[PDB]
Design a protein around this ligand. Structure first.
Ligand SMILES: Nc1nc2c(ncn2[C@@H]2O[C@H](COP(=O)(O)CP(=O)(O)OP(=O)(O)O)[C@@H](O)[C@H]2O)c(=O)[nH]1
Ligand SMILES: Nc1nc2c(ncn2[C@@H]2O[C@H](COP(=O)(O)CP(=O)(O)OP(=O)(O)O)[C@@H](O)[C@H]2O)c(=O)[nH]1
Ligand SMILES: Nc1nc2c(ncn2[C@@H]2O[C@H](COP(=O)(O)OP(=O)(O)OP(=O)(O)O)[C@@H](O)[C@H]2O)c(=O)[nH]1
Ligand SMILES: Nc1nc2c(ncn2[C@@H]2O[C@H](COP(=O)(O)OP(=O)(O)OP(=O)(O)O)[C@@H](O)[C@H]2O)c(=O)[nH]1
Ligand SMILES: [Mg+2]
Ligand SMILES: [Mg+2]
Ligand SMILES: [Mg+2]
Ligand SMILES: [Mg+2]
Lengths: 428, 426, 426, 428
């Protein structure tokens, strides 16, 4: 049992899903048709004689992206009714995503979700992929979250949010969308793992030696993180970790559930033969600011909770020693009210290699989930961004005309402020 | 899904529109009388955005062709590629307005309107999902300015939530092909103010300059000039017609680029503007394109962005690129000389990246700027109006068609207000 | 890394510059229209110092070509190798200065400057890391002297920390191709004084002498003379363009050779100056080269180093050698006749040894001397100025362009001061 | 354990390193790829299945020299991130090396250094190669030294400085660069081994019969010295010597740590068959002024401390007798306050022969490290050189414009004077 279902919302959600599912297929020896040539049960169902099918749902208020899915390398992996499309997009308008356009498609997707749940025996949770800056990825996601809360108040819901750093912003109204959606997210999410594009880009240039990263490139890395996360559910380990565990171990307080995921080692084909790939070494890499997937000012804050998910050939003793060493380093700071900061998980599967990929085959790998106070700074900058725009009512007409009232914005701002204050408090 | 209605009113519109149709057909592999010569499934996939499909796999533009003067219609049909248009979409009056806006807007326009309305309704009901409208026309003449605006108004009454786009050619001070341009411009721009979501301002002078100094051409024809406009048009809507890495439709741009309802006049620019002899000495690349797009020389509206500030900019790029590279370029542009970027809007750049480049070149960019420098254009016009109106010159013709002094006063006032608003935010 | 901008102003500059380009292209295996015919990876490695690289592996100089007279530009293009230059880097006025420095510096130069500035900015922003500038021009004419200096000034305002190099041809007393040379020289040299890091002083008379007596040639053309200059230019920058055993860039030489900011006028010399019939009777070697370089005959500036003293000397050697041998030679030169080497600067010799020799010969040396003997050159000019200025001759033309007596007085004063400074340290 | 890491700074530093590392590879049976076909552990790490990698770091504020390394015979020996380059050089300006340009690259190299340290188990020290006359080799080195002091105050740091004799000077401002850097070096170096080009040249002509020495030629000899120094760390001996020992045995007083290294025998292929290569003979050669690597006036001063590192087939008794004989000679003078002047070290490895080399295979060899008062004269001449130039403020503009103040020079001069005085004192 223990099955888990993926929901992909908006363009970002879809394209990430594309990579992830591809990766999964390669991992379990599933060809792009669906035949195999059990463990995988947690992500793939079976019907017919030999064909395997993703427990996944793709949602977009526009057909463009999902049309490619329909007519691509993986057309035969998905039954057509797990792809929902067809309409006008929430044109980077949260309100449209939430009120006008979300209203028309919600029931269909919810039915699908229910069906998927019913197919399975006692699934643990949901993995939700989206951006904060998109009208669909913002407005619709919140609505969906609400629905999920209503249906299964008990069950775990994890998300992968594509978070915008102000210097690499591609959309004008990113601040409004992010703030409104984040408030809604707050009450119904168990934890949200933030990813920053800029950080990814940086990683690509420095540690993969690629000057020109495409979106396609970026997504691969993200997929690997996902794989690392859920490998313990899919495979036999020495010490295991589940979705329930993460919620338990990362959230000191209800409101403070926004941790950063980092990954290592990230190596080109060339650099590996001059690389002593150590357990300690990768751990070390994990706590160096250049390896963060969110640009956050990590050294200024303190760490509250840290989960280290190792995969490949590992000696637990060595891991322990590495951890000890890390603890002993002075500059890295944990909160004084938590002496013991690391949840440790081990997985016997070596991470996989994508045909035509950027990443070298490695024998030891690690994904760290870490919660730091420093991430509050990101919110502060976002709030600052919001505050000036709000001041002149810039772009407000678009939102008001979509059945969203003006005091709502104010409320959201207030909430964000309170959240920020909270981080400041808990760090003492 | 996401289907569009094209409209061409007056001489300029009709010719520009023709060029546009030629371009887009070429892009999607359609021949003039020939049904289909396309090379790719992608082209096929989104034909239904701009076209309809009769029996034996024929294809036909959702385009409407309008003029009070019959002659231009004749020209359009007489050209090669003229057989592709549905004969029922040719809707012309009997006698032309003769650069009298009032005639365009009252006496003949009103008589013309009903047929047009009926055809538009027919077009709408035919198709599953209606996205927006695209009008090409002038502000200097009687038909394009007067009747066009009436048509727009009518459209608005019918479908309040649908998208209105206009590609409007504008008057320039040194070159006036009509003496009554101040009046014509004034009256039509007022009308635009209330009923359009986004308006693309285009100058002939600028185009001429581009042809002369950048493309290094001694003998520019109207067709050549129109080409640029056509290209620009194609660029705007590339997000609707192709799968990209990042997609931005008409609505998306509109939402992104209009901070206040009133300020919806966009200055387009385009890249790369290469010459024939000169092209082989350039490394084709993102940064170069970006640098080209923000030069005052490549503003199609004859205003200097050096004397104003950008509220917002949208950048639509075609061909394969590194999004990261693009973003870094944008950042560089912003931080280095933030002197002309408004502080209260933090990130003023919008990016869309579409995978399919135009025929001819491997990478290309369209730039759509909402600049406070546009106030300068309005100012000169206003001044000219003031100059004329004080002596009551040429008022009599307009009076003869129903118009009265008050209307003129009101439109001018509105224009002034608009100008003030732009200034304030600068 | 370490990328350079070349500029050519006025007739002399344009022709010399052309020659230089021909030489350096030849060295790096580049054909005139042809993209690439290079024989070695080394050549490929540092093409980006002087060139840009368009599509299909084409290559193009970061060179700017400037003149108030259109004719010379025509000549440059008309020559073979003319297709390699980017057409946008041809920036010429309409009417020439006519050996009126004031015209060069005010009336036409000012009108010309903006385009030049824009192109230079474009060039800068294109490239990752900007090293320096190289200007070729005269001090005897109106354009090279007047406009050039203005351009330099402008450049300085923009990038204060970047390297300024100039290759300046100088007036000689017996041969004057213009009667107003004293004035022209004076005004331009003042300007140079404040804005250049290093200036290479070159005389035609000296070149002629070299051609006649050393190369044993009866019929020297300008091209032949220019050849030497081109070679010298190539020699200076060999450290940037090739891996050596010891490397010295533009900056390194500058730091090494300028003890006081004011004294930055370098006298170049070159080796070996062999004749056609005479070459087979020499053993090619370090010591011979060294001996040749310190002869008064091989000073390209028409001054006798016997009547002054060296402050500093830089020696750039090309081809494989024993560094030890070179050093010993240097020592010999120093100790034997230290009579013309300044005592307070202990070791007056700088050495750079680069592995790749020019096309034709197996070992070669360029000598760059900061000699107090250069004061002699200035002195004659000063005297001539004095002679003219007392009778107010030809002042009227200069007055007609904005100039006033005071400027002349000031420049002369500055020159005198400079002369004095050189003397003091001798 | 006991590993040691090489740092190469500026052109001189790089090219010396090139030879040295080549020599090392030949010694341990390492082909230029990295496979072997333990002892060597102190200089080479291992990663992967069979590949060995230099614990070395190459630094240059300009890509020229290190680009050759990247594309040469030994391209595959180094991982690309142990080579740091790319920028404008300190154009023989100490200030640029230290202030303007050193500032931009320091962090990257320091991180690399730390990583290297972490890879190893309790490394003893650092070997730093550079010139004094180069802007990079002067200004940057001091900065690096500072950093090293900050990080590992305890650990040993040895240097190989290319010192300029005034008669064979190739750069105009050699005096300023040397003086400024030397002051900085003083506080953070355990000992600095001076090498003079002129001396090397002399050696080449007389004892190798080569009239035309190239820089490439010179470096080989230097590399041999290095090998002799560190062979005791890398190999089994009869009597051993380490880096710690040198510091102990050569430095009577904190400030006086500038000893000369000499080497013998230096023989052409031809001269060996008419050579009775004796232990005594080589010792004798060692104390003859024509064999010094610094032109210093050795007979005028006294010897304070002398380390003799023998390698090859040696009878300790014979060595002892040779030493005794040397002591008995009257002209060679030791300081009266040290009766016993020689530290003796033995190594069972015959020194190696470079393919296409100048040097004959020998069965006995010696490297002597010797500290003499005479070297103070060199400083005096340098100071004299400096003093005249300073007098007219010659070339001062270049330094002042790089964020260096004028009194600094004066201070440096004063320090040098004091140092000189000290040598004069201790020789009594
Ligand atoms: N961009 C272009 N502008 C044009 C072209 N032809 C004309 N024009 C401009 O349009 C202005 C007038 O537009 P029209 O020729 O269509 C006259 P219109 O039909 O609008 O009204 P009437 O004059 O009553 O027929 C004129 O002043 C020109 O500046 C063209 O091919 N391209
Ligand atoms: N080394 C060379 N010197 C030259 C050449 N041609 C001219 N000259 C010298 O340059 C001096 C004048 O320079 P120009 O011919 O470029 C005249 P310029 O453009 O500087 O100003 P205008 O006279 O106003 O055009 C003249 O007195 C000659 O002594 C040449 O090919 N090579
Ligand atoms: N990591 C990642 N981010 C993406 C990708 N595509 C888009 N984004 C980000 O998502 C935001 C844009 O919104 P979309 O994800 O397109 O939102 P949507 O839900 O499709 O709604 P619209 O944008 O209105 O179409 C920006 O912040 C982009 O940086 C992708 O492939 N990978
Ligand atoms: N022994 C030896 N000395 C060298 C070599 N190359 C240069 N030198 C000496 O180094 C000094 C010149 O400085 P560099 O080592 O080039 O200094 P850098 O750190 O590269 O900085 P720049 O000189 O400014 O490029 C002179 O005193 C030379 O004699 C070499 O291969 N071997
Ligand atoms: Mg989308
Ligand atoms: Mg008309
Ligand atoms: Mg001329
Ligand atoms: Mg160097």
């Amino acid at each position: 049992m223990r099955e888990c279902i993926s929901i992909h919302v908006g363009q970002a959600g879809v394209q990430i899903g594309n990579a992830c599912w591809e990766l999964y297929c390669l991992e379990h020896g599933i060809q792009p048709d669906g035949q195999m040539p059990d463990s995988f049960n947690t992500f793939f169902s079976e019907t017919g004689a030999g064909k395997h099918v993703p427990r996944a749902v793709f949602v977009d208020l526009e057909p463009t992206v999902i049309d490619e899915v329909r007519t691509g390398t993986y057309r035969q992996l998905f039954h057509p009714e797990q792809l929902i499309t067809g309409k006008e997009d929430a044109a980077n308008n949260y309100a449209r995503g939430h009120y006008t356009i979300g209203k028309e498609i919600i029931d269909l997707v919810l039915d699908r979700i229910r069906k998927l749940a019913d197919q399975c025996t006692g699934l643990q949770g949901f993995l939700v992929f989206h951006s904060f800056g998109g009208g669909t990825g913002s407005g619709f996601t919140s609505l969906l979250m609400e629905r999920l809360s209503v249906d299964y108040g008990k069950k775990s819901k994890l998300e992968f949010s594509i978070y915008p750093a102000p210097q690499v912003s591609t959309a004008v109204v990113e601040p409004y969308n992010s703030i409104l959606t984040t408030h809604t997210t707050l009450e119904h999410s168990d934890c949200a793992f933030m990813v920053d594009n800029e950080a990814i880009y940086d990683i690509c240039r420095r540690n993969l030696d690629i000057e020109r990263p495409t979106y396609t490139n970026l997504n691969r890395l993200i997929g690997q993180i996902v794989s690392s996360i859920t490998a313990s559910l899919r495979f036999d380990g020495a010490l295991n970790v589940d979705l329930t565990e993460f919620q338990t171990n990362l959230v000191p307080y209800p409101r403070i559930h926004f941790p950063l995921a980092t990954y290592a080692p990230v190596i080109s084909a060339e650099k590996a033969y001059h690389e002593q790939l150590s357990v300690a070494e990768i751990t070390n890499a994990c706590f160096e600011p250049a390896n963060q997937m969110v640009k956050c000012d990590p050294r200024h804050g303190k760490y509250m909770a840290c989960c280290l998910l190792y995969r490949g050939d590992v000696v637990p003793k060595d891991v322990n020693a590495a951890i000890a060493t890390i603890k002993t380093k002075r500059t890295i700071q944990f909160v004084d009210w938590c002496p013991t900061g690391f949840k440790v998980g081990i997985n016997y599967q070596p991470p996989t290699v994508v045909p035509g990929g950027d990443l070298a085959k490695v024998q030891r790998a690690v994904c760290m989930l870490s919660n730091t106070t420093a991430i509050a700074e990101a919110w502060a900058r976002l709030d600052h961004k919001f505050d000036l725009m709000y001041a002149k009512r810039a772009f407000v007409h678009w939102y008001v005309g979509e059945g969203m009232e003006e005091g709502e914005f104010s409320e959201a701002r207030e909430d964000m402020a309170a959240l920020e204050k909270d981080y400041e408090e808990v760090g003492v | 899904m996401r289907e569009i209605v094209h409209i061409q009113a007056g001489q300029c519109g009709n010719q520009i529109g023709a060029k546009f149709w030629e371009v887009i057909s070429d892009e999607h592999g359609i021949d003039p009388s020939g049904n289909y010569v396309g090379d790719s499934d992608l082209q096929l996939e989104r034909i239904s955005v701009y076209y309809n499909e009769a029996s034996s796999h024929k294809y036909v533009p959702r385009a409407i062709l309008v003029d009070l003067e019959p002659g231009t219609m004749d020209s359009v049909r007489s050209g090669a590629f003229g057989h592709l248009f549905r004969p029922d979409n040719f809707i012309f009056g009997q006698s032309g307005a003769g650069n009298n806006w009032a005639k365009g807007h009252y006496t003949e326009g009103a008589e013309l309107v009903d047929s047009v309305l009926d055809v538009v309704r027919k077009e709408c009901e035919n198709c599953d999902c209606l996205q927006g409208f695209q009008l090409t026309h002038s502000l200097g003449g009687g038909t394009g300015s007067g009747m066009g605006t009436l048509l727009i108004s009518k459209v608005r009454e019918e479908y309040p939530d649908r998208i209105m786009n206009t590609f409007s050619v504008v008057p320039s001070p040194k070159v006036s092909d009509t003496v009554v341009e101040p009046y014509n411009a004034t009256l039509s721009i007022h009308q635009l103010v209330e009923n359009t979501d986004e308006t693309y301002c285009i100058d002939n002078e600028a185009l001429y300059d581009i042809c002369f100094r950048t493309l290094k051409l001694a003998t520019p024809t109207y067709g050549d000039l129109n080409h640029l406009v056509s290209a620009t048009m194609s660029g705007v809507t590339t997000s609707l017609r192709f799968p990209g890495q990042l997609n931005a439709d008409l609505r998306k741009l509109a939402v992104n680029m209009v901070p206040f309802p009133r300020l919806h006049f966009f200055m387009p620019g385009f890249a790369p503007l290469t010459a024939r002899g000169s092209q082989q000495y350039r490394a084709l690349t993102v940064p170069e394109l970006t640098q080209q797009m923000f030069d005052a020389k490549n503003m199609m509206a004859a205003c200097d962005p050096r004397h104003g500030r950008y509220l917002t900019v949208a950048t639509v790029f075609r061909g394969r690129m590194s999004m990261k590279e693009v973003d870094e370029q944008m950042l560089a542009i912003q931080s280095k000389n933030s002197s002309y970027f408004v502080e209260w809007i933090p990130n003023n750049v919008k990016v869309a990246v579409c995978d399919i480049p135009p025929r001819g070149l491997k990478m290309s960019s369209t730039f759509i700027g909402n600049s406070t420098a546009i106030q300068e254009l309005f100012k000169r016009i206003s001044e000219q109006f003031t100059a004329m109106f004080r002596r009551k010159a040429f008022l009599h013709w307009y009076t003869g068609e129903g118009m009265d002094e008050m209307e003129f006063t009101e439109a001018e006032s509105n224009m002034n207000d608009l100008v003030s608003e732009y200034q304030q935010y600068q």
